[PDB]
Amino acid sequence: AMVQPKSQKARLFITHLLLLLFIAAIMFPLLMVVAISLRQGNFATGSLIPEQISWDHWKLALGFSVEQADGRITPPPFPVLLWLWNSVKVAGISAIGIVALSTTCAYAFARMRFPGKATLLKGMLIFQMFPAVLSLVALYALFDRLGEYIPFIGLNTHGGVIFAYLGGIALHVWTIKGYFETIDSSLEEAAALDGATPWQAFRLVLLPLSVPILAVVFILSFIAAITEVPVASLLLRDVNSYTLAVGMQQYLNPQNYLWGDFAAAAVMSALPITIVFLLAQR
């Protein structure tokens, strides 16, 4: 509590307003959707704030058919929930795999001496700059053969997509490596004298002290997979195996623009990462 000059508030008060105005400007789009998901009708255009609420869009987003007094019972077009579970699968499993792979590698780069460790990672980063989007053809080919040999990780499989994401770790390896080279060397040396094998140290000593950085990597990798589109919609053909990222686009056919139905599912799709950010309050 340092003593503060020039009536302080002049800037403190004028900041609460700026921040308050800012959240409003960036919240606007998100509040737009919530509104669209409560507005009756599936039209692209509509009154900013609904004249009256309409649960329809949220009903068939949860999987409920709805009977309009007109054309009978219209069933939910898409298994949004299914896709929601699919997105949380491919991303969750994908991330854990990615942290497991990159935190082991980083551990070797930062501690273990082996010639070419600098020119490897340098090559790793560079090879990762190439857009996976400019590969689909060769990627499709890979999971076509790889599929009939080991089935549960070929085309049209969640595992297929997961394994496809396990490639990118260059950036992560660096960050985790950079984080290790920050910890006290003594904690490890002292462990070595205590008779701990390199792994015993990695697990019993180094990892527990790294929780936070692993958490960031996880989250970063999680959000990544959740929104990944090009590869995911290349490998996944079955609607019942679509992830959110794939299926969420079937909503907006020009000649079948399900803007309301889409809006309801959209809010729902902002649930996974939010949960992570909330549980990330540890």
Binding site: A191, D194, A196, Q200
Partner: peptide
């Protein structure tokens, strides 16, 4: 040989009892 480090090198995530007996807890 046994070392008392300059920074103590006390494993932050382990209890006092664990810090002293860490060597003979493992192995």
């Amino acid at each position: 040989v046994g070392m008392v480090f300059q920074s103590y090198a006390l494993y932050p995530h382990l209890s006092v009892a664990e810090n002293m007996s860490f060597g003979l807890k493992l192995a």
